[PDB]
Symmetry: none
Subunit: 85 residues, 10 copies
């Protein structure tokens, strides 16, 4: 989470930036601030894991602009589509 308690239903619009700034129209005026009572984000906890086991053993791992995933392990060199899930 409860992040505010009074008047929240009173805005005419209430919506975010692409950078997460909260915007609000109230009483014909317009406001910008970060939302009330935010938490630290932690991206990894919300990300899709797509592989599990040995991923840090690659000496390089990087994409071609065509979207294939290139990789070096030991002496060898691999391309496939990225893994998915």
């Amino acid at each position: 989470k409860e992040i505010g308690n009074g008047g929240w239903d009173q805005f005419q619009f209430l919506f975010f930036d692409p950078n997460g700034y909260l915007y609000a129209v109230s009483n014909d005026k317009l406001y910008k601030a970060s939302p009330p009572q935010s938490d630290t984000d932690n991206w990894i906890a919300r990300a899709t894991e797509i592989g599990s086991g040995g991923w840090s053993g690659f000496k390089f791992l990087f994409f071609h602009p065509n979207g294939y995933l290139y990789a070096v392990r030991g002496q060898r060199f691999y391309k496939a589509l990225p893994p998915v899930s």
Copy 2:
């Protein structure tokens, strides 16, 4: 403008209470007290609503605003309180 635009559904689109995107481009819709999620339709033969996945089974009609923070967190105004969490 509607001239050059793909039509991507026909019935029902006006009976949604909210209708909007998460940062990933999945589509969200509230109807009949429920919250639905599926990727947007690309044309009229996609019974979007028939495939959507009911991520919220009741309670979703009370909302004054229902929308996404760009980090993926879902925000909600009910009555006069303001709420946030990851989507269910």
Copy 3:
């Protein structure tokens, strides 16, 4: 509480913001507004004295009040609902 949030926020606009049919962002941070059946685009105001509505370009000619939903996909596509019809394209220009 909303009033003290509003207390510590920045007042970046001061009149004429109630009257828009729609007010939302594309993914590149431009602000769109529908008013008097028209569509408008421009940088958000950074302060009280920015006459945002004078400043803004009319990308959209008429009809715009007639959309039930009008909102942006993250890939920059404009999605709109009219009557019971769902549509999609790049934004007007």
Copy 4:
């Protein structure tokens, strides 16, 4: 010779980063002291880059072995045994 004809775009501190790479739009991304930073590349030695970067990650960014962009704008990351992907974050909140 490349170095002699190169434009110098920053005069100190570049050594501190553990990753430094572009997304497909050419925003420059950086990990420093376990934090994640984003902004348009700098352009002269007086472009203080770190002081105008957005700190979009507050902690844990130094545990990754790889951190890099798919052309589709998704960020991929390897931590320990695991491989992950997600849109990059936009705020540390």
Copy 5:
């Protein structure tokens, strides 16, 4: 497993590289014993990449901490504490 179900495109020498990366058009760039090579990526183990690569960089290549392409084709680099950009070299 991913490795299993993937194409092998190279078979030896691949860790001799200090840098190994793409430009926006898909040429493979590589640093190795202080030099910079460039050629279109390999396709199978039968392909001898370093034998068909152009040396485009003569010396000093391994002094960089970072070395990577901007989508617009400008090549960026950190050496020591300083930062640089410019069109890649070309032979």
Copy 6:
């Protein structure tokens, strides 16, 4: 060189996004999404920005280049596009 030089301001001067002259010698400055205009300052006691005239009110911080043609027109590059007009 800063040996022989006149110091004509002491704060905020870095922090302008652009900083330049028209052909007549007025100084122009972009900061906080605004365009300011006033004759240059001749000393520290001159609060340039407090006197500058805000000849543009919002929209100014988008620009990759902002500069005068020597006949008095103001050229500007926003994103991909290139512009000119007499100054506001």
Copy 7:
């Protein structure tokens, strides 16, 4: 305003001559040409008007290296600072 469409931000430098030629650095090369989509200049439309009646009535009107404005109007001779606005 519009005078240019794709690419205008590619350049490293983009600035004028004293004579109005536009210079440009792109991809490590320097170009000079007239800017695109120029208009005829018309100086009188942009000049500062400093006076408003009977100015053409003078037989002579000309400056001393002083900056004093000298003027003859039928048989009499005058000097003063030029007018201002």
Copy 8:
């Protein structure tokens, strides 16, 4: 004395001009057929001045009654009832 000891710095076409005067730097200014021309004075009969002059003004220069320089390098002009000043133009643009 004067005509006999004078240097001849040009030999036809001088009659066409409606104004002809110096700016404080000593560049030569001329109006002819409603156009404004500017270049360093010529120096001999073979110095074809008008073929190397920049056409800095391309119309309405004939409607002026006076056109002259302040020592500070501003161009003053009288046209009809009105009086004006500005830096001289530098191109017909």
Copy 9:
């Protein structure tokens, strides 16, 4: 406001001033003038009691009103168009 400007200027001359075919300064501020076929030079006047034409040296005897243009370069050289021809030289001197 041509009258407005005049009203507020020093009146520095009273009559005769309209007989001048040319009337201009050199780089140092000497005033030159042509009437009849003659060139006069002196320091400019500063009130109507100053009889300028009476203190000016005649520095040019005849031919002065044959010019279309007669004017000083900043470096002190004197330029003239006569007919279709153009000339420069140090001004004459008496």
Copy 10:
């Protein structure tokens, strides 16, 4: 834009990316800042003019250090260092 360049005159052909500043004084002299040095010389008129070779070094060190460096129409050089603003005739 690509075709603006196509009809422009190419008057320089390598090494122009590296400057920190590249601007004109009111008399038409070109100034460039490179490797912490200020250079001055009339602009090339063609590809084969090795501009950086002929240019006179007129400022010996410090030149990369200004955030702005630019000319007033009356010929004065204005510069910004850190939080501070300056002006003087250019060096020589």
